[PDB]
Structures are given as C-alpha cells and as structure tokens.
Amino acid sequence: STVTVPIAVGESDFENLNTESDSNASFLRAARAGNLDKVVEYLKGGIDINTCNQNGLNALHLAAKEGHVGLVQELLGRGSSVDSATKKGNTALHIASLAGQAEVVKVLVKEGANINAQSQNGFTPLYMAAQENHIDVVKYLLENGANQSTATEDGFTPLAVALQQGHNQAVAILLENDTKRLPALHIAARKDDTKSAALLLQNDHNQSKMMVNRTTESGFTPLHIAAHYGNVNVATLLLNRGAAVDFTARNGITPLHVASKRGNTNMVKLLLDRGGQIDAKTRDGLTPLHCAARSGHDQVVELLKVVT
Template structure:
C-alpha cells in the first residue's frame, strides 16, 4: 500500500481503510500526496475530520498549518510559542495559519492566533487572494467572523473573481452574518467580475427576502 492508495481512501472517506494502510505503513502519514500537501491536510480539505484526527495520530510532528487545519490547539500553541514569527507565514499551498483555522471553524485557535499577532488582513499567497474573513464567512461561522471584524478585518476585501464576504454570506442565506457584515461597513453595491451584486447571488439561491433587503439598502 502506497501514498496513492492512502489518498484514494481519504477521498472516499473510508476511515477503516485509512487506518489499515497507516498501521501497515505509518511513514505514509508524513509523505506528501499528489496534491503536494500532506495526507492530513488533504483529509481536512475534503472535510473528513475523523480521518484527519486519525492521521494526526500517525504524524511525527504536526506543522503549525496542519495543527490549525485539524484543530489541535496544544500543538498549534506550542508551535507559535517556539516560533512566534510563524503566525504570519504561508503554507506550501499558500494559506496562513489564521486562514486555515478560520476556514475549518476552530474558533479558540483563531482567537489565539490573533492574540499572538496574526494579521487579520493578510491574504493567501496562491492566486486566490483569500483573506481570513473570506474563510470565516465561507465556513458560515458567525463568531469567528465577528472576532475578525472586531480585530480590524476589512469587510469589503475581494478574493478571486471579485467575491467579497457579503457575496458569500448572501449566497449562504445567512441573515445574521449579513447583518453583522453590514454593521461593519460591508457595501451592498460591490460587484463581482461579471457584475453580480450580493443581492443577485441571494436571489439565485432562492433567498428572495434577503435579496430584497440587500437591494433596499442599495
């Protein structure tokens, strides 16, 4: 059993098969996948939390990025205490520790990173231009989004294709997130590449009342 088989079982969400492969060949936990990321990060990106937790048990030394993605608070805090400057470094695939913690919904960890100097307005370095606030809103996480905004996150930053946080919140139909963003200065008039407003995305998803609210404010 090699890395290709491990990758295949991670993608399939087969916990027992992943465990069997790692028991037979523990070193695979520390071998990069074809996506040029670790098996643990791959499991996180596929939203396979149980599998990610399992792989973490076989990983020799979790990186700060892996710890932030999988939500291992103790490992992440230790890494930051040992190398404080790492809070604003980038993973091999271009994300910051804070961006990963926000995207995967690890609120306590995200708060810790901000407390330790993580830049809430530092975008990913991989062509996607994803800011932590984009990750928090995409995760549909009110608490982390509020924490970022309270810490000075800009509400109108745009990632690739001109997608602002309000576009995503509108698309999700999350009225609490929408109100939070509006209260912090999010602009309803921001257009994506192609010209779509947040109201347009809400309407496309069937959230017609939200679309009207956003249009009324326009």
C-alpha cells in the same frame, strides 16, 4: 442567452486528510482541528506564525474556515496579520463568511479586517455570506459598513447571487437594507443593478402587464426610477426588455419628464433615442423642456431645444 452570476468556491481541505517540514504540515493539521494547545506549543517552539500550505493558507485561515474562535483570537493576539490573503486572494474574513462562522466574523471585523476586501475573483465577504445564505453573517456585515454595491468586475453583486441561489431571506435582507417600500426590480433600478434586473426579468417574454412595466403606488416603473437616479445601464436593459419609454405615472409623468426635471442628460439622450415623446405634457401642461427649465437644468434645455 443566459445571465449567470459566478460562484465563490472556497479553499481546499487537504489538512482534513488523515495521514495513512513535516512539522509544518502537522502544525497546519493542528490548526485545522482547532487544537489551541498544540498550536501554541509549536509557536513557542519557534515555528513561523505565517507558515502556509501550497494554496497559501496559514493557521489563521484554517482556524477561521472551521470556526475556531479561540484559536483565531490567539493567533491574532500573537501578531497573525488579520488580512493575509491566500493565493486566490481570500482573507480569513472571506473564508469565515463563506463558511458562515459568525463569531469568527465578529472577531476579525473587530480586529479591523477590511470588511469590503475583494478576492482576486472580485468577491467580497458579503457576496460570500449572501451566496451561501448565511443570514446572520449578512446582517452582521451590513450593520458594520459592508457595501452591497461592491461588485465583481462584470457587475455581479450579493443581491444577484442571492437571487440565482434561490435564497429568499438573503434577498429580503439585501433589498431591505438602509431604508427606514419598493418592488425588487425597482430597487435594482435605483441601485443600477443590471445583473439583478436581468435575473428578475428572466421569465416574462412576449407591454402593459409585463413585469418590466410594473408600477409602484404612485404609478412609477423601474424605468422611471432609473431616470430619476440617472442609471443609464439599467435603463438600457429595461428598454431592451420591453419597458414602455413613454409610460405615464400619476399626473401623466413620463420617464423623460423625470430625467428632465433632474437634469439627467444621458438619461434624456437614451430616452430620446428609444423614441420618447419630446412634447408630452403632465396633467398640468408641462413638457420635458418646461420641467428642466423650472429646475435650472440648462444643460438639458439646450439639448432639448436643439432637438426641436
């Protein structure tokens, strides 16, 4: 009876262990320490730039973990492939983001690292920077195209992990992105973020003054938004958690009005199934049927006529 976002755990740090072929190990230790001169010397000496440990970390991965900007530049300069993945499927960009190494993030991004790459647990750089509350990396990633909506295979998002981890600022930046002002649940409805919705809703159990039925200025609920954008999943969740199916906004507008006006067929279906009133009327006499007609959404009309 729990909603629980998965946590990116990072790479190991065996190279930090003081010793108390072996050329390779020593080379990786030099990378971990950020000793450019030593690393360059080994490379000149012929050691392979792609040398990695049992977990698949090369020197680029180690320099990035540790914020060694200069060294990251040198390795990149020498042909280190920006997006080599470790065995967990992490790129240097994942690692730097989890670790909050902002200058390193910049350097990798400018080198064309894939800003939306997913690890084999489905995590993105943004998910990592978000999980760990690395604000500046978050902002930087957003400003550079990173997509908040790229999700673990179970729909886990940066917003969801920021929420679970209690990170107010992260949550703010994530909610406030690409808008130039709705409540969070509403925004989660827009985005169709069931997990984040679930998280937000975890403390009202039992209709009117429930959080699931809070309104915006114009009296819309998360359910109205869901209906507007045609987000069936998040709508289903809200309705399961007690959203009033026939809740009227300004002008007696119901979620069914909204979905009918936007020709959102499956929303209409869902709302009907949950008992939404087929014939409710706006302050000016419109029915869901009329709203759809005035909008050429025939798909709906048909469906809507059948029911009657």
